[PDB]
From Swiss-Prot, chain A:
Residue runs in coiled coils: none
Pfam family, one: Cpn60_TCP1
Protein name: T-complex protein 1 subunit beta
Binding site for ATP: G37, G91, T92, T93, E488, K493
Amino-acid positions noted as binding Mg(2+) in the UniProt annotation, renumbered to this chain: D90
Modification Phosphothreonine occurs at: T254
Underlying gene: CCT2
GO CC annotations, alphabetized: azurophil granule lumen; cell body; chaperonin-containing T-complex; cytosol; extracellular exosome; extracellular region; microtubule; zona pellucida receptor complex
GO terms of molecular function: ATP binding; ATP hydrolysis activity; ATP-dependent protein folding chaperone; protein folding chaperone; ubiquitin protein ligase binding; unfolded protein binding
Oligomeric form and interacting partners: Component of the chaperonin-containing T-complex (TRiC), a hexadecamer composed of two identical back-to-back stacked rings enclosing a protein folding chamber. Each ring is made up of eight different subunits: TCP1/CCT1, CCT2, CCT3, CCT4, CCT5, CCT6A/CCT6, CCT7, CCT8. Interacts with PACRG. Interacts with FLCN. Interacts with DLEC1. Interacts with SVEP1.
UniProtKB/Swiss-Prot annotation, chain B:
Name of the encoding gene: PDCL3
Record-stated family: Belongs to the phosducin family.
Endoplasmic reticulum recorded as keyword: yes
Molecular-function annotations in GO: protein folding chaperone; vascular endothelial growth factor receptor 2 binding
Species of the source: Homo sapiens
First-to-last residue of the parent protein present: 121 to 180 of 239
Main function: Acts as a chaperone for the angiogenic VEGF receptor KDR/VEGFR2, increasing its abundance by inhibiting its ubiquitination and degradation. Inhibits the folding activity of the chaperonin-containing T-complex (CCT) which leads to inhibition of cytoskeletal actin folding. Acts as a chaperone during heat shock alongside HSP90 and HSP40/70 chaperone complexes. Modulates the activation of caspases during apoptosis.
Upper classification of the organism: Eukaryota, Metazoa, Chordata, Craniata, Vertebrata
Superkingdom of the source species: Eukaryota
Modification after translation: N-terminal methionine acetylation destabilizes the protein.
Protein name: Phosducin-like protein 3
From Swiss-Prot, chain C:
Parent-record interval covered: 248 to 297 of 543
Related illness: De novo genetic variants in nearly every subunit of the TRiC complex, including CCT7, have been found in individuals with a broad spectrum of brain malformations, and clinical phenotypes ranging from mild to severe epilepsy, developmental delay, intellectual disability, ataxia, and other features of cerebral malfunction.
Compartment annotation: Cytoplasm
Top-rank taxon, per record: Eukaryota
Gene (UniProt): CCT7
Description of how the protein assembles with itself and partners: Component of the chaperonin-containing T-complex (TRiC), a hexadecamer composed of two identical back-to-back stacked rings enclosing a protein folding chamber. Each ring is made up of eight different subunits: TCP1/CCT1, CCT2, CCT3, CCT4, CCT5, CCT6A/CCT6, CCT7, CCT8. Interacts with PACRG. Interacts with DLEC1.
Modified residues (N6-acetyllysine): K3
Native organism: Homo sapiens
Taxonomic lineage: Eukaryota, Metazoa, Chordata, Craniata, Vertebrata
Primary role: Component of the chaperonin-containing T-complex (TRiC), a molecular chaperone complex that assists the folding of actin, tubulin and other proteins upon ATP hydrolysis. The TRiC complex mediates the folding of WRAP53/TCAB1, thereby regulating telomere maintenance.
Disulfide bonds: none
Full protein name: T-complex protein 1 subunit eta
Family: Belongs to the TCP-1 chaperonin family.
From Swiss-Prot, chain D:
GO terms for cellular component: cell body; centrosome; chaperonin-containing T-complex; cytosol; extracellular exosome; microtubule
Subcellular location: Cytoplasm; Cytoplasm, Cytoskeleton, Microtubule organizing center, Centrosome
Subunit composition and interactions: Component of the chaperonin-containing T-complex (TRiC), a hexadecamer composed of two identical back-to-back stacked rings enclosing a protein folding chamber. Each ring is made up of eight different subunits: TCP1/CCT1, CCT2, CCT3, CCT4, CCT5, CCT6A/CCT6, CCT7, CCT8. Interacts with PACRG. Interacts with DNAAF4. Interacts with DLEC1. Interacts with SPMAP2.
Sequence position, cross-link Glycyl lysine isopeptide (Lys-Gly) (interchain with G-Cter in SUMO2): K9, K199, K203, K254, K264, K268, K381
Family: Belongs to the TCP-1 chaperonin family.
Residues reported in the UniProt entry to bind Mg(2+): D93
Amino acids binding ATP: G42, T95, T96, G411
Residues that bind ADP: G42, G94, T95, T96, S164, G411, D481, E497, K502
Role summary: Component of the chaperonin-containing T-complex (TRiC), a molecular chaperone complex that assists the folding of actin, tubulin and other proteins upon ATP hydrolysis. The TRiC complex mediates the folding of WRAP53/TCAB1, thereby regulating telomere maintenance. As part of the TRiC complex may play a role in the assembly of BBSome, a complex involved in ciliogenesis regulating transports vesicles to the cilia.
The encoding gene: CCT5
Enzyme Commission number, as recorded: 3.6.1.-
Protein name per Swiss-Prot or TrEMBL: T-complex protein 1 subunit epsilon
Length: 521, 60, 50, 527
């Protein structure tokens, strides 16, 4: 009955708090529900204080990234999308819209004066049963090369439906596949290189049979080399300061200073000869280099490459068969990088150095000669997501069925459980099951088909036991993806459902929203 | 990080300033050993400290 | 540093190494005095180096 | 007065309240704050999610974390923030209970003070009631089973402690992990441990079941100069606090150079220094090196082509615990390097998390450690925070129950037993004082009613019938069936928590009720 908060500090300890949270959640859900299925249309994140910076995106990750809110539940869901995108890729859309539908269920349930803990326990049990059922339906492959390759092709093709690049799916999905082949079973993500060069077409893009570098060369370096013996270095080479300090030159005549200069030139030449004793035809420097070392190298006539990148040099050491060195007393204890030819290439209006016939091909370099910067940015986002999915499906070989197939499978399993369950939970779980039914429904809504007809047909098919039944998105019919080729990652859907479950658990267990008094701005 | 004429000229200017104001504590070092793997695209960054409180900043 | 105003003027690397090892020897000799003194705990206003 | 004046500077700018009605004002807030928290009691509690002044979302169930980052304007509000923080400082969950109980005492105090009774007599009665109740409660409390081989009683205690927060989602592996960790880290000879002997690190991604206990070392760096193999088998390690570089003395040093011979002397000096550092380390018989303050890439490649894995740039206490776990020793400098003090590890590996750039170094030592670490794989930053808070509370509770004969059955029942005890105490007492003990008991009954209200079922008649049961039944510890599982007996429902927690909560609430009752004047500014 007495004021206790600071000016600007608010507390809603009634259903108005959940009302505000729910309307914010719905505002989140509808904004992204247009970015799902093969029928999604992209959105614009327009700025006014960011000096008019815009980005077009389809995977709602960036959308929730670029929008804030005062209602803390919407920020909770934004962080949930953050997590989801941190795991694999697309599905943030899925998990967010699913959370919207489940909170709408919660709305309908609270509309009947029910203690939410019953809902919580029932959803716990329903999630346990659904995860068990899906695991029992987990279809696995990789025992055959052709089968596993076709599974990856199906996953990639299905995934490109959710984004723009579908227009050249056959020229993109398959290509991405070979990229993860070049990983050679290594778990690294940071070997694939992303390149954006406006101009040209997405079909004009290609995967080169080698590697490329985008750094300046030294003053006198040859343009082309064959059978390059390659070494990578990280030292001074910038008049190679002695690294010792608290030492001073203190003389009374400048002849000694002249001799010191001559001696430092000689010492630098000694370092150069120390390096050349190993014997190379191509040198790499992660950082800059000075004029006198450049003249010495030109006397040697080798390739010196200056001011490279830490991640890039790590990648190239993985690639060409060498490792970075910093001391050169051992022409015997180092492995040298190897390539067939190192030439010059002009791409876009930027200059690149081309590695052709590299001894190995672990890392990857994907050049995008697209047509606009914004399409380039969204293309790189999409390929990042796709390669993350590819890496994840290479990691765990188990796969699942999309087009609602697994979805209606768990829906029907929860249906039967609720049927054999007494109490409110059952219908709640049934509504929970109904909640799941909304997910493929919205997909059809993206297509704009006969919604209720299709949902009824799928429920009838899954009640009949046809466990491969799905939705045909090419015409609006019901078929088998085993014929069609619509397969997805078991890990992806599994974690989608589990994360959605725990997010619902945490969101439903709220009772009082208290926004602290703003500091200032 | 020594090597760029930016950092070299800044070091020259501050060293010459030391000749004028011997009442100011100057500190120079390699940021790599001061901050691990510090981004080399963020130099030379001027820091103004007293009692552990940043008063002035001049970054990059 | 000794008294915050001490200056070191040497001419070769051997002198440098001798001086730094000598600083270490001062440190470790104080440590030896403390340890061989027999006390099990030490307290002070002044900071204790790592 | 005949003429106006002022004795107080800005006398008309500061307000002044007094009298018993002034107490009313505090008691006013005594509703809201208590009424704020009454909604979260029970294992099926309904958490609170709120924003700080900067724009961060926090969800939790305990009292102290709620009250701290809650914007509090009234001064009783800040007093109660301090109160719940102290309660957390001692126990953990139940902070909500302390707030609710102290509040309920405050409303009943306002109700009964209207009769015109001396507040000092009220405080005396409350103190007598509290001491009698605590005496009886400690008398009745039974003994707990603690062992290094038997853990199930403590597993049930921990599981009950998880019966206040979200962590009851798994609720089984958590108790086992907590008991194992507290047993491993604990100092045996003194019945004590220190939580700085424990590290908690929570990483996004994963599932609640992925939560695990490692009696090893978790480091968040990777193989320095990472173009070497990303793991190794059993490793022998030396621990250094110095970089790999010709050191500079603390004193202003000036090396005079006048000859090109001194130039070559400097070159020889640096090269021989690096090579002798390598000779020293590789010669003493280790495989792994760790550097507190990093070092230069020259020594990096020297370590690489020597095929001796190494790491650098590690935090201080991190290295301290690393040395603790490996059993080796931190050598301050190369002179004191010895083979005897090298450490040994059962396994070290680099975690890639599939797609994230970050890598953490997991280390399982060849030998056990008196330090254990916690790693979390979840799907929300806020849930990570809540899990960490719950784990800290669980370790605190397990340390609390490390003492024998300290268990009692709660569940809103021991409050009933003490209520009967204090009712009798009032009976064996003249009037004019016994109203205080009546109020004490009525406040005692408050918590079970809130519990049942959090069950959404009929609170009052269930509470009265269970009280009648405990009076009639032979079980002095029978509580409330709050999860549709049947009986009301605690000995088979296993709402198991430490007695010291309840004694502390009761005494602390009594002291703060005294503190509020003692004061009646406020002089404050309003500009």
């Amino acid at each position: 009955p007495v004021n206790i908060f600071k000016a600007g500090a608010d507390e809603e300890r009634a259903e108005t708090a959940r009302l505000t949270s729910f309307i914010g959640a719905i505002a989140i859900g509808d904004l992204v529900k247009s970015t799902l299925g093969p029928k999604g249309m992209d959105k614009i994140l327009l700025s006014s204080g960011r000096d008019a910076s815009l980005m077009v995106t389809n995977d709602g990750a960036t959308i929730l990234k670029n929008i804030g809110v005062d209602n803390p539940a919407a920020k909770v869901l934004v962080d949930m999308s953050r997590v989801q995108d941190d795991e694999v890729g697309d599905g943030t859309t899925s998990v967010t819209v699913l959370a919207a539908e489940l909170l709408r269920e919660a709305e309908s349930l609270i509309a009947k004066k029910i203690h939410p803990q019953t809902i919580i326990a029932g959803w716990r049990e329903a999630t346990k049963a659904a995860r068990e059922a899906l695991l029992s339906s987990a279809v696995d492959h990789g025992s055959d090369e052709v089968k596993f390759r076709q599974d990856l092709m199906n996953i990639a093709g299905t995934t490109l439906s959710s984004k723009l690049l579908t227009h050249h799916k056959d020229h993109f999905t398959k290509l991405a596949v070979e990229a993860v082949l070049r990983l050679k079973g290594s778990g690294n993500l940071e070997a694939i290189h992303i390149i954006k060069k406006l101009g040209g077409s997405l079909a004009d893009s290609y995967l080169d049979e080698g590697f490329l570098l985008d750094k300046k060369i030294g003053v006198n370096q040859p343009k082309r080399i064959e059978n390059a013996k390659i070494l990578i270095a990280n030292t001074g080479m910038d008049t190679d300061k002695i690294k010792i300090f608290g030492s001073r030159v203190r003389v009374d005549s400048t002849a000694k200073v002249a001799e010191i200069e001559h001696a430092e030139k000689e010492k630098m030449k000694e370092k150069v000869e120390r390096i050349l004793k190993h014997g190379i035809n191509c040198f790499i420097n992660r950082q800059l280099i000075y004029n006198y070392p450049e003249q010495l190298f030109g006397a040697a006539g080798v390739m010196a490459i200056e001011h490279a990148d830490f991640a890039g040099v790590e990648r190239l050491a993985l690639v060409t068969g060498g490792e970075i060195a910093s001391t050169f007393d051992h022409p015997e204890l180092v492995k040298l990088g190897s390539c067939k030819l190192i030439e010059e290439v002009m791409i876009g209006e930027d200059k690149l150095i081309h590695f052709s016939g590299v001894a190995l091909g672990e890392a990857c370099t994907i050049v995008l000669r697209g047509a606009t910067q914004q399409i380039l940015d969204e293309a790189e986002r999409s390929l990042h997501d796709a390669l993350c999915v590819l890496a994840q499906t290479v990691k765990d070989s188990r796969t699942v069925y999309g087009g609602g197939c697994s979805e209606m499978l768990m829906a029907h399993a929860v249906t039967q459980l609720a049927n054999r369950t007494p109490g409110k939970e059952a219908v709640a779980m049934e509504s929970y099951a109904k909640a799941l039914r909304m997910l493929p429904t919205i997909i059809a809504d993206n297509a704009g088909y006969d919604s209720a007809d299709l949902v009824a047909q799928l429920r009838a098919a899954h009640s009949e036991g046809n466990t491969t039944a799905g939705l045909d998105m090419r015409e609006g019919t019901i078929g088998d993806m085993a014929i069609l080729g619509i397969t997805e990652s078991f890990q992806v859907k599994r974690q989608v459902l589990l994360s959605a479950a725990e997010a619902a658990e945490v969101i439903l267990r709220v009772d009082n929203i208290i926004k602290a008094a703003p500091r200032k701005r | 990080k020594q090597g760029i004429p930016l950092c070299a000229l800044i070091n020259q200017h501050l060293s010459g300033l030391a000749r004028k104001f011997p009442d100011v504590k100057f500190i120079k070092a390699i940021s790599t050993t001061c901050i691990p793997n510090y981004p080399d695209r963020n130099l030379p960054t001027i820091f103004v400290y007293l009692e552990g409180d940043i008063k002035a900043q001049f970054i990059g | 540093a000794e008294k915050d105003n001490a200056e070191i003027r040497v001419h070769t690397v051997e002198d440098y190494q001798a001086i730094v090892d000598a600083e270490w020897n001062i440190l470790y000799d104080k440590l030896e005095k403390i340890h061989h003194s027999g006390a099990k705990v030490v307290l002070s206003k002044l900071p204790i180096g790592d | 007065y005949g003429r106006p004046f002022l004795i107080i500077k800005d006398q008309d700018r500061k307000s002044r309240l007094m009298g018993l009605e002034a107490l009313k004002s505090h008691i006013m807030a005594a509703k809201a704050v208590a009424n704020t928290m009454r909604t979260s009691l029970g294992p099926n509690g309904l958490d609170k999610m709120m924003v700080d002044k900067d724009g961060d979302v926090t969800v939790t169930n305990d009292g102290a974390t709620i009250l701290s980052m809650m914007d509090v304007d009234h001064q009783i509000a800040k007093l109660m923030v301090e109160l719940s923080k102290s309660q957390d400082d001692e126990i953990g969950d139940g902070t909500t209970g302390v707030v609710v109980l102290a509040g309920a005492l405050l409303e009943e105090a306002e109700q009964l003070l209207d009769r015109g009774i001396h507040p000092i007599r009220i405080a005396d009665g409350y103190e007598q009631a509290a001491r009698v109740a605590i005496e009886h409660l400690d008398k009745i409390s039974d003994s707990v089973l603690v062992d290094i081989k038997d853990t199930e009683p403590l597993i049930q205690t921990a599981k009950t402690t998880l019966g206040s927060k979200v962590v009851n989602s798994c609720h089984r592996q958590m108790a086992e992990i907590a008991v194992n960790a507290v047993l491993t880290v604990a100092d045996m000879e003194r019945r004590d441990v220190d939580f700085e002997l424990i590290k908690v690190e929570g990483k996004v991604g994963g599932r609640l079941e992925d939560t695990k206990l490692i009696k090893g070392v978790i480091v968040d760096k990777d193989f320095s100069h990472p173009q070497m193999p990303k793991k190794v088998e059993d490793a022998k390690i030396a621990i250094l606090t110095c970089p790999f570089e010709p050191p500079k003395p603390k004193t202003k040093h000036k090396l005079d150079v006048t000859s090109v011979e001194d130039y070559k002397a400097l070159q020889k000096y640096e090269k021989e220094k690096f090579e002798e550092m390598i000779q020293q380390i590789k010669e003493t018989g280790a495989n792994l090196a760790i550097c507190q303050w990093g070092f230069d890439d020259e020594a990096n490649h020297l370590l690489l082509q020597n095929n001796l894995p190494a790491v650098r740039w590690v935090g201080g206490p991190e290295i301290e615990l690393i040395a603790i776990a490996t059993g080796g020793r931190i050598v301050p400098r190369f002179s004191e390097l010895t083979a005897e003090k090298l450490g040994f590890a059962g396994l070290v590996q680099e975690i890639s998390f599939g797609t994230t750039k970050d890598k953490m170094l997991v280390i399982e030592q060849c030998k056990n450690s008196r330090a254990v670490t916690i790693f979390i794989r979840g799907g929300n930053k806020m849930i990570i925070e809540e899990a960490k808070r719950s784990l800290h509370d669980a370790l605190c509770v397990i340390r609390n129950l490390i003492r024998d004969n300290r268990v009692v059955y709660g569940g809103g029942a021991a409050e009933i037993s003490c209520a009967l005890a204090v009712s009798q105490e009032a009976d064996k007492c003249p009037t004019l004082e016994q109203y205080a003990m009546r109020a004490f008991a009525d406040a005692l009954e408050v918590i079970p009613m809130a519990l049942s209200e959090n069950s959404g079922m009929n609170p009052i008649q269930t509470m009265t019938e269970v009280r009648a049961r405990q009076v009639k039944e032979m079980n002095p510890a029978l509580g409330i069936d709050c999860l549709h599982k049947g009986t009301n007996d605690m000995k088979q429902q296993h709402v198991i928590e430490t007695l010291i927690g309840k004694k502390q909560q009761i005494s602390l609430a009594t002291q703060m009720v005294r503190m509020i009752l003692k004061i009646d004047d406020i002089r404050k500014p309003g500009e």
